Amino acid sequence: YHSRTESSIENFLCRAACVYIATYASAGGTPTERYASWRINTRQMVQLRRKFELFTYLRFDMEITFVITSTQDPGTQLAQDMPVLTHQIMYIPPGGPVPNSATDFAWQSSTNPSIFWTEGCAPARMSVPFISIGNAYSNFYDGWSHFTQEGVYGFNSLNNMGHIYVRHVNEQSLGVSTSTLRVYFKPKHVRAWVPRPPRLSPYVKSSNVNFKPTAVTTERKDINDVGTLRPVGYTNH
């Protein structure tokens, strides 16, 4: 008759997990290499996916922490003394403008909350509430997008969470300054409904529930084959 407090939904699902690692440069190059983008979802990290897909419906708040580490870049014309690096982190709600390049107008939109962060301080954090039209997120959706019974199968538009975009505020004239971003994601005030059997087959697609047939368990020698045995000894005489 010992405690069960560690098996509750809160203590089971509120563990921070690293869900994205990206890199971006601070100088000339291909524009797509000068910013980092991520669409918020729980279907790309298999370890977190297996935990969220024990329940059919979920309702939680998001807490996102960004760890940013920058270093100098080898080449010619190295910077002898740089003041400090500042980074801009922008959260785009569902339906907001999304940048197609760095130094775009969407970076200065008033509907997108942004964080300006200087090197040396504590990691930046933000919290997003339960932002959806429906009354819950749904891990499994059996249905179509249009009512013609045709379209994308298994896609629901009621569980969009937005995007995260990170770039360098500074304009650098001497040298390049590569930076690396890590995203830590955590649910809070979690509520879950309608439990489901955990998955057996390995994941094959982030968008689908497709699978390969897998054996229901691990093989055994015989039906009456108990595990191994013990040799004769002082107790067994």
């Binding site: 997120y137 249905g143 699978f211 229901v216």
Partner: protein, 247 residues
Amino acid sequence: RVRSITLGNSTITTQECANVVVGYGVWPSYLQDNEATAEDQPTQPDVATCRFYTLDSIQWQKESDGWWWKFPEALKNMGLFGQNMEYHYLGRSGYTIHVQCNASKFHQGCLLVVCVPEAEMGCSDVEREVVAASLSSEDTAKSFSRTESNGQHTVQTVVYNAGMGVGVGNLTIFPHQWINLRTNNSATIVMPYINSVPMDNMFRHYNFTLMIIPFAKLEYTEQASNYVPITVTVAPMCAEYNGLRLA
């Protein structure tokens, strides 16, 4: 011993004293004033929706594997329920599922009847995607398979994975019942409306899936009926639809 039920004044059914499983503990009911994200007050058709709709019987044989029906699609052509599906836009209703077998005392077997909510299914080719014709017919059972399917747009039908990619042995987590021919002969499941929105389109959303799977195969002697008939009956409970009149 026996009990008769008369719903809709047009349907008669007979049952014996047996255990009934009430969904997730809740009973189907109308929509209260607490929950809503629309304006027009729902119209409540109950004169003809609440009646027994007996689907066609199926044959349980020695080498059969299992069957599934998608609801609410299974009642697309079923009388006035189909007309309300076509004429309206939003809908909500719970169901009562009766499953009855007809086997003598000399047969043997064991069935599992489950009601899986939001039973999304995979495809045979892991790259392609399923189509609407392979998921479910109108009111005809879709059979499982003993071996691995190899179609292009066909749902994977290996029985022991149940098409959802999970172990078939753990399907008991959902509302379910066991029909052991040695003791039981029928099962009843009352399923309420389960979704994340108060109303949804009937043709777009598959509310749930009814699966019948034999764990113990059918066995008998030479001079006996080669099959066992299984009969499934559905009676909608507490159906609602949007309003078609100006405010």
